[PDB]
Assembly symmetry: C3
Homo-oligomer: 216 residues x 3
């Protein structure tokens, strides 16, 4: 542990050049098998969310988002407890990678990203937007509690997670909804897909979504 | 150490994927755990997904197991013996169906891996299950079956080790078929057979 | 660890690992390397160093990237020229190339020995006799050539083969195989810039699956 890899970036520095699932040791020494992206933007990113085919249901409850769900073989959410543990020491960059159904790639990159602990409802703490073809659709959500269908912490009199079939740091309501429904390209329905407002908008659900972190 | 995928789930392993468990005799085995289906903690012993793996194999091959962690496999008759049953099915339009049985077991090679099933509990895919290889004649129905329907099974109304024919096919009952599901002329996109304490 | 660990995928097969998948082996210098073992094909025990299956990975990469390796354990990859040299530098490894088209037809080629030289020798291909194979022999043509990438032209053409055929290979003047070419999905009108094996499906058909793999012989 004290001499073991603590991030995907550590692994890259130690000559692990292929993306895939590797064990790392969290700050408290807990081992955790995580997906490393060793290619994108210099490589060494720890991936905490992945959408690619709609095989996994993301419309899930608080407990499920807390612990994590999905499959190493495809789509997953790494889990709110784990994402907190990964980001708690304050200085990881965030990258969001998005691909549409014509294989057009867009991204957003943020200077810092953290979620707080469960007691603080996994509050989003987001640093400055640095750049990205996808534009900034996350700053809007800064300093907001995470919400799921069964724990509404949003700023709407109704339930955002239900209204947009997802789980997110909803306010009233969103400009991004990456845990929304896998609706496959253009959809008439308003904003309930894998949507990034400044990217492809409220009526286009991406083919691929990945959210990932790396020591700044 | 963990003895089942249910044990791994209990220990905080929440994502499906390959994990090592310890069989009743302490022999380590890396198995696929389904942590997301129906409560989770299932050990998957058969999987079809892309037709990348040849399932028309002989006795020794089904005995020891074959395929790939990257996709399709048969965990192996020796392993499956050492280890409720659920069958999960998906068509090329991404429609999900399933079955479920109260008990499931296979005997050793002396018993020639005789199937010891149980009661059909439920399942949208319906009931089509209530061992023979191409080089081991054991069929129920006289003559041959494995060679006839190009698979390996307890020879049928189901044929999950059949050919990956990809959806509707003209040939008869020789694909990944489940009578009560899509019939003898439709081969599933995805098939999985899994167990749990 | 290295004292008792497997040194090849063949060792793993012998120890009772019957499913293909990623396993750690120990290189001749004790360096551990997680490699993909093919335990299914032709007796099993093969170490896979190249895999194409879905076009998710860009193979049009520079010398540095080919040297260290790139791609994903989840699908497509090039294990890396330094690793391939390490794996084949000593003893005799045979080579098998497995190819699948989009109509489910499987072809292969098998070679008696296969070695890539070190970086100073530009990862020179040292290939033994063609043994057999439904894909025909489209690699002997490339024996005793340097590896070339878009940024490192070591080929025998007055132009840049890597750029012209959008890949990285032991290009001559220029090629009969191009398995690191673009994932063009079957028939393509562009000339010889896909995952092509001339004696197999020709210069205008890019395979669905390509695997290159080695085993002690
Ligand atoms: C592999 O191919 C090389 C040439 O190809 C280059 O090197 C290889 C390793 C790859 O990296 C390729 O990409 C390169 O393009 C062959 O080398 C030639 O071999 C022939 C004999 O088969 C040599 O011809 C002889 O030359 C003798 C003089 O040798 C010295 O002087 C020459 C220049 O005249 C010089 O080139 C050579 O290296 C020596 O310094 C001569 O006495 C004799 O009569 C005969 O003609 C030829 O010179 C070599 N060329 C080169 C460029 O070295 C390898 O033999 C071949 N190996 C195998 C296993 O087939
Ligand atoms: Ca509300
Ligand atoms: Ca040239």
């Amino acid at each position: 542990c004290l001499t073991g890899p603590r991030t995907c970036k550590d692994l890259l520095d130690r000559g692990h050049f292929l993306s895939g699932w590797h064990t790392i040791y969290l700050p408290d020494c807990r081992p955790l098998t995580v997906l490393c992206d060793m290619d994108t933007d210099g490589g060494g990113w720890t991936v905490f969310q992945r959408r690619v085919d709609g095989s996994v249901d993301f419309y899930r409850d608080w407990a499920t988002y807390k612990q994590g769900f999905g499959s190493r073989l495809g789509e997953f959410w790494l889990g709110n407890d784990n994402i907190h543990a990964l980001t708690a020491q304050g200085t990881s960059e965030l990258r969001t990678d998005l691909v549409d159904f014509e294989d057009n790639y867009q991204f957003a990159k943020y200077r810092s990203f953290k979620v707080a602990d469960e007691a603080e409802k996994y509050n989003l703490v987001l640093g400055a937007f640095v750049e990205g073809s996808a534009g900034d659709s996350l700053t809007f959500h800064n300093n907001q509690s995470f919400s799921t269908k069964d724990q509404d912490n949003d700023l709407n009199t109704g339930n955002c997670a239900v209204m947009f079939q997802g789980a997110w740091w909803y306010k009233n309501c969103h400009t991004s909804n990456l845990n929304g429904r896998y609706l496959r390209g253009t959809h008439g329905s308003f904003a309930n897909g894998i949507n990034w407002k400044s990217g492809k908008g409220y009526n286009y659900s991406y083919k691929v979504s990945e959210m990932k972190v790396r020591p700044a």
